[PDB]
Each structure stands twice: as structure tokens, then as C-alpha cells.
Enzyme design. Structure first.
Site, PDB file in Angstrom:
ATOM      1  N   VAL A  17       0.832  -1.202   0.000  1.00 18.75           N
ATOM      2  CA  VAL A  17       0.000   0.000   0.000  1.00 18.75           C
ATOM      3  C   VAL A  17       0.876   1.266   0.000  1.00 18.75           C
ATOM      4  O   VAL A  17       1.904   1.311   0.675  1.00 18.75           O
ATOM      5  CB  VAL A  17      -1.080  -0.022   1.127  1.00 18.75           C
ATOM      6  CG1 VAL A  17      -0.507  -0.550   2.402  1.00 18.75           C
ATOM      7  CG2 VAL A  17      -1.764   1.352   1.310  1.00 18.75           C
ATOM      8  N   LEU A  75       5.348  12.036  -7.325  1.00 15.74           N
ATOM      9  CA  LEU A  75       4.861  12.601  -8.584  1.00 15.74           C
ATOM     10  C   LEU A  75       3.361  12.737  -8.422  1.00 15.74           C
ATOM     11  O   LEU A  75       2.748  11.952  -7.701  1.00 15.74           O
ATOM     12  CB  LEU A  75       5.139  11.669  -9.755  1.00 15.74           C
ATOM     13  CG  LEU A  75       6.510  11.535 -10.431  1.00 15.74           C
ATOM     14  CD1 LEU A  75       6.703  12.540 -11.576  1.00 15.74           C
ATOM     15  CD2 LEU A  75       7.638  11.578  -9.445  1.00 15.74           C
ATOM     16  N   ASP A 119       6.657  -5.920 -14.297  1.00 18.28           N
ATOM     17  CA  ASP A 119       5.227  -5.643 -14.167  1.00 18.28           C
ATOM     18  C   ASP A 119       4.845  -4.228 -14.602  1.00 18.28           C
ATOM     19  O   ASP A 119       4.304  -3.433 -13.822  1.00 18.28           O
ATOM     20  CB  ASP A 119       4.738  -5.941 -12.744  1.00 18.28           C
ATOM     21  CG  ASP A 119       3.224  -6.033 -12.655  1.00 18.28           C
ATOM     22  OD1 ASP A 119       2.586  -6.456 -13.648  1.00 18.28           O
ATOM     23  OD2 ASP A 119       2.678  -5.681 -11.583  1.00 18.28           O
TER      24      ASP A 119
HETATM   25  O1  LIG Z   1      -3.799   8.556  -7.822  1.00 18.90           O
HETATM   26  S1  LIG Z   1      -2.353   8.384  -8.211  1.00 18.90           S
HETATM   27  O2  LIG Z   1      -2.189   8.557  -9.687  1.00 18.90           O
HETATM   28  N1  LIG Z   1      -1.870   6.871  -7.717  1.00 18.90           N
HETATM   29  C1  LIG Z   1      -0.469   6.521  -8.010  1.00 18.90           C
HETATM   30  C2  LIG Z   1       0.128   5.753  -6.830  1.00 18.90           C
HETATM   31  C3  LIG Z   1       1.546   5.285  -7.181  1.00 18.90           C
HETATM   32  N2  LIG Z   1       2.539   5.808  -6.222  1.00 18.90           N
HETATM   33  C4  LIG Z   1       3.094   7.018  -6.342  1.00 18.90           C
HETATM   34  N3  LIG Z   1       2.321   8.110  -6.467  1.00 18.90           N
HETATM   35  C5  LIG Z   1       2.847   9.339  -6.585  1.00 18.90           C
HETATM   36  N4  LIG Z   1       4.174   9.500  -6.563  1.00 18.90           N
HETATM   37  C6  LIG Z   1       4.985   8.468  -6.431  1.00 18.90           C
HETATM   38  C7  LIG Z   1       4.473   7.182  -6.315  1.00 18.90           C
HETATM   39 BR1  LIG Z   1       5.640   5.689  -6.131  1.00 18.90          BR
HETATM   40  N5  LIG Z   1       2.080  10.420  -6.722  1.00 18.90           N
HETATM   41  C8  LIG Z   1       0.739  10.480  -6.791  1.00 18.90           C
HETATM   42  C9  LIG Z   1       0.081  11.598  -6.256  1.00 18.90           C
HETATM   43  C10 LIG Z   1      -1.306  11.726  -6.300  1.00 18.90           C
HETATM   44  C11 LIG Z   1      -2.051  10.727  -6.912  1.00 18.90           C
HETATM   45  C12 LIG Z   1      -1.410   9.616  -7.454  1.00 18.90           C
HETATM   46  C13 LIG Z   1      -0.024   9.490  -7.409  1.00 18.90           C
END
Ligand SMILES: O=S1(=O)NCCCNc2nc(ncc2Br)Nc2cccc1c2
Length: 275
Positions: A17, A75, A119
Site C-alpha cells: 500500500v 509525482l 510488471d
Molecule cells: O492517484 S495516483 O495517480 N496513484 C499513483 C500511486 C503510485 N505511487 C506514487 N504516487 C505518486 N508518486 C509516487 C508514487 Br511511487 N504520486 C501520486 C500523487 C497523487 C495521486 C497519485 C499518485
């Protein structure tokens, strides 16, 4: 770990998670991945050395009384979310081209270091407001992007699996629909078969010798590739078919993909994101 304040849950995967989190000292916003172990430790720590602008950086690894915390650069969005947001209008071709180029740059880097992602999927692709796209979350619930040789039980599969996955993603960006949305391992494979033709020794030598190969497979005609990613242009359709060659040895490599005419006019536009 007492150093971080959980801000919110932003994602989840089969073995982790992900939380948005701020470091209480530095003030920095990071992505925290909570996992649940000794061979994985070196492996994870070798991924720390991996430094490339199109690869999401692993900042720190934190092992607290069983529970592996992975701290990644943050990001603001992933590609699935960006695709869903662009569903009605479409991502502009220049931006698709740029994204593919950068992702291939990421892969060419990892691959030259004998590291595979394994993946690849839209949820593991992260974008910024600056036009960058980055591979996240290298593997050590979606088979939609899984290469056929994996599905056929090949144990010692190569970097070429990542290109197959990226081709699926490219098509998906272009069509706004998953290319091969399989329900199971055999549905995934037959959906590939229905579109690209049942493979045999003519197009993929050795195939009939694969662990899970069955002479009982239905024989589908390769369909018209014009029907797969319209209205993608011939340069684009040409690259994609090479990214989706059955035979992993003839599947175009990342480095070679960079030199493809498709990328002659490649540029770096930005997305319109809504954060
Ligand atoms: O809803 S999301 O597109 N879900 C992506 C989750 C993947 N993990 C992740 N997310 C973000 N930055 C780095 C990482 Br690793 N950033 C991120 C920030 C806000 C929303 C999302 C990602």
C-alpha cells in the site's frame, strides 16, 4: 519512520500500500510504500543505485521490526488516472510520442544494467506537470500487459517482456481502451491469439516446445493491424508491431526503438493535469 507523517493513501498493489507522506524533518513530500526477507534486501538496495530521470527514484529503504518501508520520490499523478481523465478527448499524439520515447529511455537504461521491470502497467507510470513520465515500482493484479512467453511458462524471460508491456500501453494510450483485457491466464493468451494470430514455429520458433504450450490451441488468423490502433500513423503502427513481435529474440529492444523513424519529430509538450 517516526520521521514521517502519513498524509493519505494514494494507491495499493498486490504486495504493497502507498501513502502520500511528509518527512517531519526535511519537510519533503514522498511516496511511502508499506510492504508486509534477506535476498530481497540486496535486490531492493541494488535498485537504489538505479539513477535515471525517467525512473522514479527510490530515496530510502526502512526495515522496522518486520515491515519493509520503501520511500520513493513523489509525482502528482499516474497514467491510468491521466488516461481516464483524457477519455473523451484523447491524449494528443505529440504527447503520446514523448511519453513513449521517455519510457523507452527508462527501459534502455534499466535494461543495459540487466534490470527488468517485469510488471509494467499504467498504474506504475507517473507523470508531472513538466511533461516527464517515469517508471515506478519495479517488480522483483493485471495480466493485460504480460508478454506471451511469460504466459506460456518461460521461466528465464528477458528484458523483452518490458517492451511487450510498453507496446500494450502505447496502443492503450492511442485507442483509449486496453489492448488485451484478459479475464484469466488463458483468456489473456487467447485474446492475444485472436488479434496477432495463433503463434507457431513459422513466426516463433521454439514456441511449441514451451512449458504451457498446447497443440490444442485454436488457430486464429492474424488480423489486419490497421484494425488494432486506428487512426495511428504507419510510423507508429510500424514501431508497435515490432514491440509486439511474438518471438522475444526478434522483439525490438528499447535502444533500437529509440532510433525508429517515429521519433524523428519527437518533442516535449506538457499535459494539462488537474491535481
Ligand atoms: O492517484 S495516483 O495517480 N496513484 C499513483 C500511486 C503510485 N505511487 C506514487 N504516487 C505518486 N508518486 C509516487 C508514487 Br511511487 N504520486 C501520486 C500523487 C497523487 C495521486 C497519485 C499518485
Amino acid at each position: 519512520m517516526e520521521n514521517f507523517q502519513k498524509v493519505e493513501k494514494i494507491g495499493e498493489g498486490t504486495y504493497g500500500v502507498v501513502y502520500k507522506a511528509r518527512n517531519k524533518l526535511t519537510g519533503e513530500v514522498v511516496a511511502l510504500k508499506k510492504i508486509r526477507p534477506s535476498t530481497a534486501i540486496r535486490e531492493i538496495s541494488l535498485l537504489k543505485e538505479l539513477n535515471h530521470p525517467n525512473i522514479v527514484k527510490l530515496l530510502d529503504v526502512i526495515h522496522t521490526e518486520n515491515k519493509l518501508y520503501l520511500v520513493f520520490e513523489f509525482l502528482h499523478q499516474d497514467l491510468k488516472k491521466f488516461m481516464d481523465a483524457s477519455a473523451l478527448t484523447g491524449i494528443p499524439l505529440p504527447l503520446i510520442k514523448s511519453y513513449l520515447f521517455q519510457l523507452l529511455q527508462g527501459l534502455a537504461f534499466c535494461h543495459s544494467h540487466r534490470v527488468l521491470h517485469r510488471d509494467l502497467k499504467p498504474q506504475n507510470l507517473l507523470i508531472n506537470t513538466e511533461g516527464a513520465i517515469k517508471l515506478a515500482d519495479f517488480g522483483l493484479v493485471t495480466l493485460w500487459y504480460r508478454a506471451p512467453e511469460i504466459l506460456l511458462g518461460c521461466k528465464y524471460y528477458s528484458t523483452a517482456v518490458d517492451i511487450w508491456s510498453l507496446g500494450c500501453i502505447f496502443a492503450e494510450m492511442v485507442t483509449r481502451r486496453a489492448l488485451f483485457p484478459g479475464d484469466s491466464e488463458i483468456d489473456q493468451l487467447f485474446r492475444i491469439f485472436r488479434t496477432l494470430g495463433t503463434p507457431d514455429e513459422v513466426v516463433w520458433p521454439g514456441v511449441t516446445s514451451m512449458p504451457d504450450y498446447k497443440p490444442s490451441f485454436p488457430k486464429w488468423a492474424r488480423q489486419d493491424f490497421s484494425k488494432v490502433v486506428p487512426p495511428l500513423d504507419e510510423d507508429g503502427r510500424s514501431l508497435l508491431s515490432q514491440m509486439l513481435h511474438y518471438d522475444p529474440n526478434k522483439r525490438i529492444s528499447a535502444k533500437a526503438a529509440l532510433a525508429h523513424p517515429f521519433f524523428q519529430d519527437v518533442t516535449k509538450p506538457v499535459p494539462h493535469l488537474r491535481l
